[PDB]
């Protein structure tokens, strides 16, 4: 079921109704005939001007767009306030370049003349999680939008009343309805969708096993597919490391979002030299946390999501506890109404003991010890995820030289992850494939037309 | 069973033993080496020299390779020569390209320094049809060979003995084992490779129903790919074409390797006025078709592929006259062992006809009619299919602004298809998703790995 129930006091304050079998069948007609319009008729200046105003609206109502997601999934409102930014941003992005990237490419060749047309496909699906309920969106939406590709969304479960605002937004801005269009369907309507001759393509944002399902259905209907998935991101301290600075990203690292973040820094690798002076940093750090209200500007550690993530989060650091690790921090129960759980500290992890290969969506902080570059490099990469990760150094070549040894699609120099709108995102293995953002995710589902003329 | 049965006469000349469990289970593990070598020392330069001598090779024994691909699928020996000598291109190309191709990319940001570089992922899996035996293979090996990604190869059961030789010749000039390596495995087989960790990737070039197994096989394992599917392709003839042009080149945009193309102009649409006019000249063309022995450098025409492709070609022409389309040309058996199907032409095709959705993998011409350009685009566009298509006019202009409006991957102006190295190639809808060849082509499994350096 949608419904909006506040992690914070665990009441529920909205219910909504799915949509119907009718709906669904309307709602993919009218994108479908919003499709063919677009690709018979040149609208992207519409398009453009609408997608500012979707800005320019998100910029003027910015606090109630935050306040709606930290009701949704309890994120602290100021965090929820960055979020509406980056999506002001993202949306600016690709309406700015919207000429640039839609332009034709010429190819050389001596046997005649060569190019290719960038155009639209079709209907896109996107299956978006609730950890950033407008920024998901945005990713996928705003390319899409320009390159003419109409979208149908299936959001969170805990998300609606953001999933639902997202769509009354871009309405409000102008654009033709059928843009975007959010759906309350259920796990079987979704592979009606996917099976549906109107969707060309399918965009999936979240877990293993829901990638996994609609991957599959999407290959069996032929349709191409986006899948990020999610990460266990290594955070390596080299030996020439700037700990002044490396005592400023950690708070942010791990903790922000509650550590519900694809690309939080999960699991920190510090050298032997290091390792007791890391512990003692890392605690100090994740001693400053202070939780409650997320509305309340002094909190700085919101709850979870769900009482499911709660209990997630809290077997996990007793799965590890129970086969071998150690309890460095907190671990402590927090009595409160809330999905709270207290920031954490594991060390002492092995690769006999179940989490040291698994993602922890929560506070917590994993330590591995290594006694070389060598063996940092051999741990961050024996892992099952490779979307993001960081290498703290003071030399930049240095830096750089070992990002390229780690297998992942993603590598921040002595900082925790960023994601801007010019930077493509996305992983390797079983963190997905395929990418989101800059150019690179613009062309996801736009069919490269090859016209060629020979001599 | 994986068997040559030369197609002219009908005779079992090599019958290959499939892959045992274990066998599998050992390329992949070299495969697997072969990738995390190439990933941890650079060896470029001799892959690089490597596959220039591939190409060498091939040059030197052209003959011998034509042959092979003439016993096994039955096209003319002077064809087998034509599809060596562009694998000959293929590979120098990406030879020459490599550095090019590899060099990191920078990413223009304000907030710091960022690029991307282009890294291999691992072993991909590529499944093959028979239509062009060494082209097929070709157009992903040598890609993926320059990127460093090892290559494990299922090719069509009729075609065994050039699958085998292609990975001799890549052993021959040099190359380590495993950079591919021919697996005569069952469908079950391939299931277990899709599902084996190895395994980073899937590129399979056939029909739907071999499309939609692999794709949701490789969708529930989380396994990226790319499909090159049929093509139903229709050949535009507009009011300013220069008939003495078209007349030139008809022959080989359908009787080409017997119709067997993925890009063969399947669709002849042409206006009222030249209807008539198109009928007498088709038919012209068509009676020059001289069918026999494929070695011999007198033949013409080829025979089909196989026994069941011939069956399968026969029943769609009985199909389409047994639900209204008229014969205008050929339709009657050639008495000879080999699987020969004689130059057929139809007409009066209506939507109501199954045959006027389908594809027709050999020598029949079909012609559509219509009353305007407008009509003309409506008939392009009222497929299943998208893959290539031809726009036949003098006004070079007016052709290119024609292709933009039809729903395909590709467009060829007054020309059948065409494959060249720098240009990539591939469809839209049932055609399948992403490219092959060019630069497009060479990224399809590549990990774009973003570092990023905030001020
Ligand atoms: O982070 P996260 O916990 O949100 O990751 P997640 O559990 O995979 O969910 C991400 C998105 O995928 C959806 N989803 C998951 N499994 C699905 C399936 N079998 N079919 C269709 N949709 C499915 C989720 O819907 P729900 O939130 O409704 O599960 C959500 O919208
Ligand atoms: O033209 P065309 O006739 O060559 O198109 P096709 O029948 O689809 O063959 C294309 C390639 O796909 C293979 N293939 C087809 N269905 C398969 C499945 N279910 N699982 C794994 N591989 C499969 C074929 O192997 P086979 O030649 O062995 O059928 C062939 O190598």
Request: hydrophobic share 40%; net charge negative; charged share 25%.
């Amino acid at each position: 079921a949608y419904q909006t129930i506040y992690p914070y006091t665990n009441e529920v304050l909205h219910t909504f109704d799915n949509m119907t079998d009718q709906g669904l069948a309307d709602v993919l007609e009218r994108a479908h005939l919003l499709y063919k319009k677009w690709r018979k008729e040149d609208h992207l200046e519409e398009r453009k001007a609408q997608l500012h105003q979707v800005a320019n609206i998100l910029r003027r109502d910015r606090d109630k767009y935050a306040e709606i997601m930290t009701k949704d999934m309890g994120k602290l409102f100021t965090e929820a306030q960055g979020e509406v930014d980056l999506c002001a941003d993202i949306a600016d992005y690709y309406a700015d370049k919207a000429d640039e990237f839609l332009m034709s490419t010429p190819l050389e060749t001596d046997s005649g003349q060569a190019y290719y047309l960038k155009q639209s496909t079709g209907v896109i699906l996107a299956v978006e999680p609730w950890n950033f309920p407008y920024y998901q969106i945005m990713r996928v939406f705003a390319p899409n939008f320009i390159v003419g590709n109409p979208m149908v969304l299936k959001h969170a479960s805990i998300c609606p009343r953001s999933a639902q605002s997202f769509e009354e937004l871009v309405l409000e801005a102008g654009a033709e309805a059928g843009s975007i269009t959010n759906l309350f369907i259920s796990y079987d309507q979704v592979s009606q969708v996917i099976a549906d001759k109107r969707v060309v393509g399918v965009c999936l944002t979240g877990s293993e096993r829901g990638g996994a399902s609609i991957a599959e259905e999407a290959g069996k209907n032929l349709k191409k597919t986006t899948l990020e998935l999610g990460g266990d991101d290594a955070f390596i301290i080299l030996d020439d490391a700037d700990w002044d600075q490396l005592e400023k990203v950690l708070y942010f690292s791990r903790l922000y979002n509650a550590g519900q973040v694809c690309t939080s820094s999960k699991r920190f690798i510090v050298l032997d030299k290091d390792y007791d002076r890391f512990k003692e940093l890392l605690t100090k750090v994740f001693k400053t946390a202070k939780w409650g209200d997320p509305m309340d500007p002094e909190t700085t550690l919101a709850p979870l999501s769900s009482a499911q993530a709660k209990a997630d989060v809290l077997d996990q650091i007793k799965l590890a506890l129970d086969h071998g690790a150690e309890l460095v921090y907190g671990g402590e129960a927090i009595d409160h109404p809330g999905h709270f759980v207290m920031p954490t500290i594991i060390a002492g992890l092995t690769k006999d003991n179940p989490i040291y290969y698994q993602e922890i969506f929560g506070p917590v902080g994993e330590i591995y010890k290594v006694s070389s570059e060598e063996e940092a490099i051999e741990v961050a990469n024996d892992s099952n995820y490779g979307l993001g990760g960081t290498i703290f150094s003071s030399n930049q070549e240095h830096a750089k030289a070992v990002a390229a040894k780690i297998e992942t699609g993603m590598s921040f120099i002595n900082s925790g992850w960023t994601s801007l709108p010019e930077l493509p995102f996305g992983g390797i293995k079983h963190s997905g494939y395929g990418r989101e953002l800059s150019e690179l995710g613009f062309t996801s589902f736009v069919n490269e037309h090859l016209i060629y003329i020979p001599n």
